[PDB]
C-alpha cells in the first residue's frame, strides 16, 4: 500500500458562505458496530460534512490515496 | 504501508463564512462498538465536520495517504 | 509504516469567520466501546470538527500519512 | 513506524474569527471504554475541535505521520 | 518508532479572535475506562479543543509524528 505525491513548481480561490440553521445534527465519519464479529473500515481523503458544506479546490496539488482494507483468514 | 509526498518550488485563497445556528450537535469522527468482538478502523486525510463546514485548498501541496487496515487470522 | 514528506523552496490565505450559536455540542474524534473484546482505531491527518468548521490551505506543504491498523492472531 | 519530514528553504496567513455561543460542550479527542477487554487507539496529526473551529495553513511545511496501531496475539 | 524532522533555512501569520460564551465545558484529550481490562491509547500531534478553537500555521516547519500503539500477547 504505497501512495506517492509529487508537486514541482482578480480573485482566485475565493469563497463566501452564509449559513443559518436553527437545528443541526451532523455525523461526520462514523463506524458503528452492534453485536458484530469483524468490522474493517477505512476512510481516506477529504470528507467534508456539514449542514452546509463547501469544498473548494480540494486537490490543487498532487493527491494520492492508497488503501488496502480487509482480512485474511 | 508507505506514503511519500514531495513539494519542490488580487485575492487568492480568501474565504468569508458567516454562520448562525441555534442548536448544533456535531460528531466528527466516531467509532462506536457495542458487544462487538473485533473492530478495526482507520480514518485518514482531512475530515471537516461542521453544522457549517468549509474546506478550501486542502492539498495545494503534495498529499499522500496510505492505509492498510485489517486483520490476519 | 513509513511516511516521508519533503518540501524544498493582495490578500493570500486570508479568512474571516463569524459564528453565532446558542447551543453547541461537538464530539471531535471519539472511540467508544461498550462490552467489546477488541477495538483498534487510528485517526490520522487533520480533523476539524465544529458547529462551524473551517479548514483552509491544510496541506500547502507536503503531507504524508501512513497507517497500518489491525490485528494479527 | 518511521516518519521523516524535511523542509529546505499584502496580507498572507491572516485570519479573523468572531464567535458567540451561549452554551458550548466540546469533547476534543476521546476514547471511552466500558466493560471492554482490549481497546487500542491512535490519534495523530492535528485535530481542531470547536463549537467554532478554524484550521488555516496546517502544514505549510512538510508533515509526516506514521502509525501502526494494533495487537498481535 | 522513529520520527525525524529537519528544517534548513504586510501582515503574515496574523490572527484576530473574539469569543463570547456564557457557558463552556471543554474536554481536551480524554481517555476514560470503566471496568475495562486493557486500554492502550496514543494521542500525537497538535490537538486544539475549544468552544472557539483556532489553529493557524501549525506546522510551518517540518513535523513528524510516529506512533506504535498496541499490545503483544
Q: Identify the chains in contact with D, defined as 3+ C-beta pairs within 8 A.
A: B, C, E
Strands C47-56 and B47-56: what pairing? parallel
B8, B26, B36, B37, best to mutate vs chain D, most D CBs in 10 Å: B26
b/e code B8-38 from CB counts within 10 Å (16+ = b): eeeebbbbbbbbbbbbbbbbbbbbbbbebbb
**What are the φ and ψ backbone dihedral angles of B22, each rounded to 5 degrees?**
-70, -45
Contact B64 C59 (CB under 8 A): no
**CA max distance for chain E:** 58
Report whether D18 contacts C19 (CB < 8 A).
yes
Specified resolution (Å): 2.8
Residue of chain E minimizing CA distance to D28? E28
CA pair distance E5, A69, nearest whole angstrom: 29
Chain D residues lying within 8 Å of C70, measured CB to CB: 69-70
Residue A34, classified by CB atoms within 10 Å of its CB into exposed (0-12), middle (13-18) or buried (19+), is exposed
Output the CA angle D55-D58-D64, nearest 5 degrees: 140
Contact residues for D38 (Cβ-Cβ < 8 A; gap 6+): C37, C38, C39, D71, E37, E38, E39, E40, E71
What are E3's strand-pairing partners?
D3
Nearest to B51 by CA among C24, A67, C8, D15: C24
Q: Note whether C touches E: 3 CB pairs or more under 8 A.
A: yes
Nearest to A52 by CA among A23, A15, A19, A25: A19
Output the CA angle B17-B20-C28, nearest 5 degrees: 80
Residue of chain E minimizing CA distance to D30? E30
Contact residues for C34 (Cβ-Cβ < 8 A; gap 6+): B33, B34, B35, D33, D34, D35, D36
CA pair distance E19, B26, nearest whole angstrom: 19
Contact residues for A49 (Cβ-Cβ < 8 A; gap 6+): A26, A27, A28, A29, B47, B48, B49, B50, B53
Chain breaks of chain C after residues with C–N above 2.5 Å: 9
Give the strands of the sheet with E63-69, arranged side by side: A63-69, B63-69, C63-69, D63-69, E63-69
CB atoms within 10 A of CB E18: 11
CA pair distance C54, D59, nearest whole angstrom: 15
Give the strands of the sheet with B38-43, arranged side by side: A38-43, B38-43, C38-43, D38-43, E38-43
Eight-class DSSP state of B41: E
CA pair distance C65, B2, nearest whole angstrom: 8
The beta strands (E) that lie in E9-73 are given as 11-26, 29-34, 38-43, 47-56, 63-69
Rounded to the nearest angstrom, the minimum Cα separation between C50 and chain A is: 9
Rounded to the nearest angstrom, the minimum Cα separation between C30 and chain E is: 9
Eight-class DSSP state of E57: S
The beta strands (E) that lie in C1-73 are given as 2-8, 11-26, 29-34, 38-43, 47-56, 63-69
CA pair distance A44, B18, nearest whole angstrom: 28
Output the CA angle D37-D65-A33, nearest 5 degrees: 35
E25, E56, E72, best to mutate vs chain D, most D CBs in 10 Å: E56
CA pair distance D51, A45, nearest whole angstrom: 23
A27 annotated as belonging to a binding site for a ligand: yes
Rounded to the nearest angstrom, the minimum Cα separation between C65 and chain D is: 5
Could you tell me the end-to-end alpha-carbon distance of chain D, in angstroms, rounded to an integer?
19
b/e code C21-59 from CB counts within 10 Å (16+ = b): bbbbbbbbbbbbbbbbbbbbbbbbbbbbbbbbbbbbbbb
C25-54 residues touching D, CB cutoff 8 A: 25-54
Output the CA angle E66-E68-E73, nearest 5 degrees: 170
Report whether D46 contacts E58 (CB < 8 A).
yes
CA pair distance D7, B29, nearest whole angstrom: 30
Contact residues for E34 (Cβ-Cβ < 8 A; gap 6+): D33, D34, D35
Report whether D67 contacts B41 (CB < 8 A).
no
Contact residues for B15 (Cβ-Cβ < 8 A; gap 6+): A14, A15, A16, A17, B54, B56, C14, C15, C16, C54, C56
Contact B67 A46 (CB under 8 A): no
b/e code B39-73 from CB counts within 10 Å (16+ = b): bbbbbbbbbbbbbbbbbbbbbbbbbbbbbbbbbee
CA pair distance A59, A64, nearest whole angstrom: 10
- Known binding positions of B: 27
Query: Phi/psi zone of residue C5: left (φ > 0), alpha (ψ -120 to 50 degrees), beta?
Result: beta
Strands A29-34 and A38-43: what pairing? unpaired
b/e code D9-26 from CB counts within 10 Å (16+ = b): eebbbbbbbbbbbbbbbb
Rounded to the nearest angstrom, the minimum Cα separation between D49 and chain B is: 8
Judge whether B61 is closer than 8 Å to chain D, CB to CB: yes
Report whether A17 contacts A54 (CB < 8 A).
yes
Amino acid at each position: 500500500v504505497v501512495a506517492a505525491a509529487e508537486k514541482t513548481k482578480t480573485k482566485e480561490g475565493v469563497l463566501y458562505v452564509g449559513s443559518k440553521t436553527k437545528e443541526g445534527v451532523v455525523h461526520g465519519v462514523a463506524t458503528v458496530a452492534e453485536k458484530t464479529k469483524e468490522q474493517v473500515t477505512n476512510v481516506g481523503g477529504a470528507v467534508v460534512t456539514g449542514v452546509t458544506a463547501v469544498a473548494q479546490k480540494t486537490v490543487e496539488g498532487a493527491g494520492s490515496i492508497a488503501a488496502a482494507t480487509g482480512f485474511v483468514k
